Amino acid sequence: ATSPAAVLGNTETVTANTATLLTALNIYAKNYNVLRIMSGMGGLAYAN
Amino acid sequence: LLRGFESSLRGSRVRTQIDDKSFIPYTWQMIDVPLAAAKTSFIAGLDTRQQLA
């Protein structure tokens, strides 16, 4: 990582040694649901 | 006037006069409306994964 000639002068399949610090994996999903509200009370339609 | 006066004699100072009474007519307010209730399938939800289709 300390030599920009090697970082800015390389190919698709490699990256820098400092990359081993990205130890946390974050997988997100954004979904649909239905919020049902009746008679002053509310709650979700689908639970799982 | 002198011997016909309403003193508090022991027995009239008995703790039941305060203890056997409730605080409820003093602490509750009138509410006058419906209480909440709903089914589980509404508040929780339908289990969508456990089904044939």
Curated annotation (Swiss-Prot), chain A:
The record's induction entry says: Expressed in the late phase of the viral replicative cycle.
What is the similarity comment for this entry?
Belongs to the NCLDV major capsid protein family.
Q: Where in the cell is it found?
A: Virion
Span-the-membrane segments of this chain are none
Remaining remarks? The viral capsid possesses up to five major capsid protein variants. They behave as asymmetric capsid components.
- Please give the function described in this protein's UniProt entry: Major capsid protein self-assembles to form an icosahedral capsid with a pseudo T=169 symmetry, about 190 nm in diameter, and consisting of 1680 major capsid proteins trimers. The capsid consists in 5040 copies of the major capsid protein (hexamers), 60 copies of the penton protein (pentamers) and 1800 minor capsid proteins of different types. The minor capsid proteins form a hexagonal network below the outer capsid shell, stabilizing the capsid by binding neighboring capsomers together.
Q: Please state which portion of the whole protein this structure contains, as first and last residue out of the total length.
A: 390 to 437 of 437
Q: What is this protein called?
A: Major capsid protein
Q: How is it modified after translation?
A: Myristoylated at the C-terminus.
Cystine links in this protein are none
| Organism annotation | Paramecium bursaria Chlorella virus 1
Which residues are tagged as glycosylated in the record?
10, 17
Curated annotation (Swiss-Prot), chain B:
Where is this protein localized, as stated in its record? Virion
- Induction or repression: Expressed in the late phase of the viral replicative cycle.
**Record's superkingdom?**
Viruses
Q: How does it assemble?
A: Interacts with the major capsid protein.
Function, as annotated, reads: One of the minor capsid proteins that constitute a network internal to the major capsid proteins and outside the lipid membrane. The minor capsid proteins glue and stabilize the capsomers.
The protein, known as: Minor capsid protein 3
